[PDB]
Write a protein that holds these residues in place. Structure first.
Motif, short mmCIF file in Angstrom:
data_model
loop_
_atom_site.label_atom_id
_atom_site.label_comp_id
_atom_site.label_asym_id
_atom_site.label_seq_id
_atom_site.Cartn_x
_atom_site.Cartn_y
_atom_site.Cartn_z
N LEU A 52 -17.30 -1.90 0.68
CA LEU A 52 -18.30 -2.42 1.59
C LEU A 52 -19.70 -2.21 1.02
CD1 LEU A 52 -16.94 -1.14 5.03
CD2 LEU A 52 -16.42 -3.26 3.84
N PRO A 53 -20.65 -3.11 1.30
CA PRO A 53 -22.03 -2.88 0.88
C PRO A 53 -22.69 -1.79 1.71
CG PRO A 53 -21.88 -4.88 2.16
CD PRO A 53 -20.47 -4.41 1.96
N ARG A 54 -23.79 -1.26 1.17
CA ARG A 54 -24.48 -0.13 1.77
C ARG A 54 -25.83 -0.49 2.38
NH1 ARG A 54 -24.64 5.18 -1.57
NH2 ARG A 54 -24.22 6.00 0.53
N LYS A 55 -26.37 -1.66 2.08
CA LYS A 55 -27.70 -2.06 2.53
C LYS A 55 -27.61 -3.25 3.47
CE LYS A 55 -32.17 -3.22 2.53
NZ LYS A 55 -33.42 -2.43 2.70
N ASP B 264 -21.66 -11.48 -1.70
CA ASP B 264 -21.95 -11.27 -0.29
C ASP B 264 -22.42 -9.84 -0.04
OD1 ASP B 264 -20.63 -13.94 0.74
OD2 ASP B 264 -19.12 -12.98 -0.53
N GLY B 265 -23.53 -9.72 0.67
CA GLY B 265 -24.19 -8.45 0.88
C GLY B 265 -25.22 -8.10 -0.18
N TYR B 266 -25.15 -8.74 -1.35
CA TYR B 266 -26.11 -8.57 -2.42
C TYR B 266 -26.59 -9.93 -2.92
CZ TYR B 266 -24.40 -3.75 -2.54
OH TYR B 266 -24.05 -2.47 -2.21
#
Ligand SMILES: Nc1ncnc2c1ncn2[C@@H]1O[C@H](COP(=O)(O)OP(=O)(O)O)[C@@H](O)[C@H]1O
Ligand SMILES: [Mg+2]
Ligand SMILES: [Zn+2]
Lengths: 193, 49
Positions: free
Chosen positions: B46-49, A68-70
């Protein structure tokens, strides 16, 4: 670049064009306008803009999924799995180039003893003026003046230069004007052959 | 998997730990939902993009 000869053309077909690559010493030869035999390999080289439509492609065997997020969407997913498009083209590498049919001292040295014997036999014949007329044009009747003129043009003169920077022509130009069907194009075709 | 006897001498207070989280973006206010957390004493980045 090389091209397929006329004798190999099938019905209603344009000659095929191919790319040849020379490495190191063989680079020197094969000037433009020649008619030569090549000996080498046939090798596949990749191309870029061949596929306007998706085709065969590569990928990795690793069973990797996104997080998730990638998430492996289009661009990022394609870049992560290392997808490359399999496009190719055919290229010929040459290792031997020869003339299809093969500095006066160099020419004399190239010729063998039998060839030099034939050349010397030709050299001391007055009929060389006559027999060369009949040899190149066996079928055309008469018009020996045109044959002599064409032979003289073929042999040509000597070019020279002057001290003022000017140059003098050494070549000969010939024109033929005649009534229809007077074998006028036969001379052109024979000289071309 | 292990089996062990013992005597308990200290017990901390009951607290709260997250198992599913959702985050929001600053500018476009988009959301990522239903992210599963790992059990045990493990965090999350947490993601960065
Ligand atoms: N003197 C000649 N000897 C042999 N054949 C000839 C002679 N004159 C004409 N021909 C024949 O007639 C035809 C002449 O056509 P062509 O030479 O193409 O005419 P042009 O060149 O004037 O257009 C040739 O096919 C050739 O075979
Ligand atoms: Mg003609
Ligand atoms: Zn955003």
């Amino acid at each position: 670049r090389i091209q397929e000869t006329q004798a190999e053309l099938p019905r209603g077909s344009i000659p095929r064009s191919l790319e040849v690559i020379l490495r190191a010493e063989a680079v020197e030869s094969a000037q433009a306008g020649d008619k030569c035999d090549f000996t080498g390999t046939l090798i596949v080289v990749p191309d870029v803009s061949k596929l306007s439509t998706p085709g065969a492609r590569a990928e990795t065997n690793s069973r990797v999924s996104g997080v998730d997020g990638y998430e492996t969407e289009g661009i990022r997913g394609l870049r992560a799995l290392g997808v490359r498009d399999l496009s190719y083209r055919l290229v010929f590498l040459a290792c031997c180039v020869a003339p299809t049919n093969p500095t006066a001292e160099s020419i004399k040295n190239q010729m063998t003893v039998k060839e030099w014997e034939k050349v010397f036999e030709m050299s001391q014949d007055k009929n060389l003026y006559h027999n060369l007329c009949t040899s190149l044009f066996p079928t055309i009747h008469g018009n020996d003046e045109v044959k002599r003129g064409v032979l003289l043009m073929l042999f040509g003169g000597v070019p020279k230069t002057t001290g003022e920077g000017t140059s003098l022509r050494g070549d000969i130009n010939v024109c033929i004007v005649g009534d229809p069907s007077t074998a006028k194009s036969q001379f052109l075709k024979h000289v071309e052959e | 998997l292990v089996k062990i006897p013992g005597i308990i001498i200290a017990a901390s207070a009951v607290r709260a730990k997250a198992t599913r989280i959702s985050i929001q973006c600053r500018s476009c206010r988009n959301t990522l939902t239903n992210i599963a957390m790992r059990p045990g004493l493990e965090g999350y980045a947490l993601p960065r993009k």
